[PDB]
Amino acid sequence: AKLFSPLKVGAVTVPNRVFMAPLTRLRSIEPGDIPTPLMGEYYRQRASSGLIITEATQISAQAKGYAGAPGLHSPEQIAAWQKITAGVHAENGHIAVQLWHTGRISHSSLQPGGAAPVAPSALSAGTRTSLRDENGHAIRVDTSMPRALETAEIPGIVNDFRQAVGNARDAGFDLVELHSAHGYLLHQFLSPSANQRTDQYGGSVENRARLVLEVVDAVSQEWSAERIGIRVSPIGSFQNVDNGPNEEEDALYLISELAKRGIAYLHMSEPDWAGGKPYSEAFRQKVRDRFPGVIIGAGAYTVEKANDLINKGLIDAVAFGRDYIANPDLVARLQKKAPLNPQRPESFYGGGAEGYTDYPTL
Template sequence: MSRKLFSRYSLASLVLPNRIVMAPMNRNRATDSQLAASAMTARYYAQRASAGLIIAEGTPVSPQARGCACTPGIYSTAQIAGWRQVTTAVHDQGGRIYLQLWHVGRVGHCGLRADASPPVGPSTIALHNDRVPVLDGGKEPVLQPCDPPRALRTEEVRAIVVDFARAARNAMAAGFDGVEIHAANGYLFDQFRCPYLNDRADAYGGATHKRWRFLLETTAAVAEAIGSERVGVRISPLGTAHEMQPDPAPLFTYGYLACQLDQLGIRYLHVYDQSGNWIHDPQSDLLQHLRACYSGTMILCGGFDRERAEAALRNDCGDLIAFGKHFIANPDLVERLRIGAPLAHWNASTIYKGGAQGYIDYPTLQEEAHSER
């Protein structure tokens, strides 16, 4: 079998020891009043520092951006200090780590903000079935239906561009190696992209290039703030998370975006297939089109195992492969993949529960062997 998955790769000034990326995954462990990452979070990421690159969890760029209880932010001094614990711990273990910058848009609840303000989006079109975790007077988050959103005014859209640039500078102050802009999974930028949700008549609605304007202006602002070589963007073509509908013209829509991001010179494009289907087909029109339109580093994510990862790299469909939930239960995932060891399975009930259980207590192969002795 090919061993390309374990070969070195240069990502701007970062030399990755392997092509395995830890995908961003919310873990909802920020329980203090400042909503800052804790020493436990630092341990969690340090345990997984053997990944070629860690992309830390989706992190709200402002109080308005929040969509889940107990997610650490990157908009305050205390939050910068909390994340600095994390980056120091990862770097001390020889790792590399980016931060995913996040605004949930309409996927939210009034109870997630101190001023009880409603979620915001491109329009007032609400979610019907989605629920989000909210602290409702107790210690444990409970799932509540999303509140109807308020449509952003044009000047507010431009203010969010500033929020992202500020958050990127905060991430650099916290010691991250770069940032990823979350434009996937039915969150704010994906909502503006969607012609079924975006009914705006201003500069951010209508034709495809106008619906992508928000993301492209944000990406340009972030690149100007910290350097394009430290910026990535994540997208989820054909995704249906958070009641989204697949784009009616994905080759044109995402091809246009990929070309524009290529011109901005950002470091990578992170492509997530929520279905875990088309991304494994080297003949996929969408995958080939994205590869042709974007000349930088491409990260592929969605249902990969070692065999599928090696095949994607061998067929030059992408440059790096992101693994998500396998990293939850396998802090030494890189070593397990390298030697073909069995993978531990994650406990779904503790992914978002809080506390150490199901977070930092999954053993490595070495720890398992030691306990058996």
């Protein structure tokens, strides 16, 4: 029953702890990377969630690495998001925008001027991203070799997160979630496998965490620390980005730095979903010891797991991913122990209403 009780999340009080994890769906309008009324209906259908966390959204045009992913850096984008947030709030829902810079998980055809994408170091991501073929359908393509950011360019990255959070506030969102996970730009700097820099942003864990903490500080001053959430994936390997040979201690360092800044929540994307070893309770307790604020757990969660960890005080809420794709009233289904619709993975990425707004309620 506690999974269905209210929770204060920074400045915002949500009615339950069944959260919608951020899910890239690649249905935005190109050119311009504009959210659509169809996306608004998708999110409106899921506003019984205690907190919707949007698909990852570009902080700038440079941030783009997927065709079809939305932006929050242009007046067109802001206007369209404003209708989405209004739609969710008119269902008495709550909504946070996940903000990313994709870094080296990108393609030069998606970048301003067709230039190479940026990263902490000029090292191939060794993975693929999603473009659109001439008929508008998602296709997987090798990422482009990135250019290493100059030291003097790091403030511009911070400044672009800062402005994007300003726009998130103007656009009506309740919170923002910094995307510091899954091998995108912030995680690239955190990871010794993607970051081989020789300036103050590479090497030691203090140098590697510096950018993400500069971002947290800037966006907290732009809006408020109690409006800032962050998603991390600091244990295991994700999209070919690992967390180095001291991953547990390094993770606990970052978590303690985040706690010092009073942020609204810590959202941990666990490896049990991808194919790694799941968090031990001893690790979870070390996290909790360092982070007394809201912790969101994610990745292959049962209701059993959710109750267990919530009743134990180790997490405060759970973000459901694929089950939210297929079940707009997931909250009701979980309370009533009803069954779930089956997922149609062939329509997760790209397309239109089918596999998106056409999953039914009880």
